[PDB]
């Protein structure tokens, strides 16, 4: 009343810390009789990316995926095995190909994010040739 104070400011989202930096998925030894028909795929393998120590002000985290994708759109195989591609999805049945982004909320009680994913190897053209499978997917996080 006698004197007025206008206090302005802003809350901005600061980066968290990444707990899983070099996650790996070992599909094991696959058999070519099960990956012969077109569209045949291996079994789903789960991979989880968790972040911790999210500062207050960061309520959502968006992970962007990137990798070498062949003409089929799935991540290319740098191993010897041919006619095979690496597929990555979330638990919501959404294909997170190269360039795809998924957004999750930050648990207020523990200040931690968690990306539930699942990876497999599938043949689209059919006839998966014998050989090694090796692929790398790089994920970058933007905090909002």
């Amino acid at each position: 009343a006698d004197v007025t104070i206008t206090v302005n400011g802003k809350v901005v989202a600061k980066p968290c810390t990444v707990s899983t930096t070099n996650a790996t998925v070992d599909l094991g030894d696959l058999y070519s009789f099960s990956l012969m028909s077109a569209g045949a795929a291996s079994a789903w393998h789960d991979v989880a990316l968790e972040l911790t120590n999210c500062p207050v002000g960061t309520s959502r985290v968006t992970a962007s995926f990137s990798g070498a994708a062949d003409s089929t759109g799935y991540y290319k195989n740098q191993g010897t095995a041919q006619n095979i591609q690496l597929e990555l999805q979330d638990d919501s049945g959404n294909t997170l190909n190269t360039g795809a982004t998924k957004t999750v909320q930050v648990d207020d009680s523990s200040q931690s994010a968690h990306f539930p994913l699942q990876v497999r190897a599938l043949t689209v053209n059919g006839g998966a040739t014998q050989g090694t499978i090796q692929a790398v997917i790089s994920i970058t996080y933007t905090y909002s």
Binding site: T4, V7, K10, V11
Partner: protein, 279 residues
């Protein structure tokens, strides 16, 4: 008889009646606070001093107008203290010179509040005075009404204390952070002072002010005010001790605070009102 001022030089309309546009420098003083000092502005002279000598007086009924119309005080008429509003005719002042001598008239206001004030915008009337002028040449006596107008925006103090600024804006750093609020108060006499904040608080303790941001508010966070690391709840009096003519800093420091649950990025804005109370 010609009267003029350097800044406005208002044209008189309707005989001796005229307006004026003069700057205001209200300063808190012991007893009463001066509002307008017409001595530095109004300059009057006699066109023909050798033939006609004028006598100017202030008739009863002169008062304030608008928001000031409910306030009183005193008038320094040629160095004489006369109670205000004018309930009687003041002694006249002679004019028999061609020089633009200053008009010895000062206007005061009686303190009725603790430290509050009223804001007057430019171009708004403040006082309405009734003047009566006679002459030694003959019985030509004429009365007119002078209305005082403001050419600038200023807040005339109503209480016995003054503050550095009536409106203070402070920008906190990004969450989390703090900022000291620049605000000091002084008074004409050594007296105890107490101030309490105001506003729409959020928590049940009346200590966290709601984030009243217009565009993209940051939910779950509000603004607190502290002093010397002590939380100040709203509508709780804090005593400043003995405050004299020297300015005393309230020590207020704005800080962030958490109101609800998850904090979301965005803007934060809180408007707080501090009122001063005598002790």
């Amino acid at each position: 008889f010609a009267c003029k001022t350097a800044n406005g030089t208002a044209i008189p309309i309707g005989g001796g009646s005229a307006n004026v546009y003069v700057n205001l420098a209200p300063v808190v003083n012991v007893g009463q606070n001066l509002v307008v000092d017409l001595s530095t502005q109004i300059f009057c002279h006699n066109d023909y001093p050798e033939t006609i000598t004028d006598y100017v007086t202030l008739q009863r009924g002169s008062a304030y107008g608008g928001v000031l119309s409910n306030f009183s005080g005193t008038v320094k008429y040629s160095g004489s203290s006369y109670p205000f509003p004018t309930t009687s005719e003041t002694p006249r002042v002679v004019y028999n010179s061609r020089t633009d001598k200053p008009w010895p008239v000062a206007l005061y206001l009686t303190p009725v509040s603790s430290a509050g004030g009223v804001a007057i915008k430019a171009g708004s009337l403040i006082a309405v005075l009734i003047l009566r002028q006679t002459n030694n040449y003959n019985s030509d006596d004429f009365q007119f009404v002078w209305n005082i107008y403001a050419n600038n925006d200023v807040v005339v103090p109503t209480g016995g204390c003054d503050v550095s600024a009536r409106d203070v804006t402070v920008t906190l750093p990004d969450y989390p952070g703090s900022v000291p609020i620049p605000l000091t108060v002084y008074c004409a006499k050594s007296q105890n002072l107490g101030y309490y904040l105001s506003g729409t608080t959020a928590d049940a303790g009346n200590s966290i002010f709601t984030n009243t941001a217009s565009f993209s508010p940051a939910q779950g966070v509000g603004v607190q005010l502290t002093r010397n690391g002590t939380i100040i709840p709203a509508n709780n009096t804090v005593s400043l001790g003995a405050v004299g003519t020297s300015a005393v800093s309230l020590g207020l420091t704005a800080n962030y605070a958490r109101t609800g649950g998850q904090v979301t990025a965005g803007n934060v804005q809180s408007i707080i009102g501090v009122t001063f109370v005598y002790q």
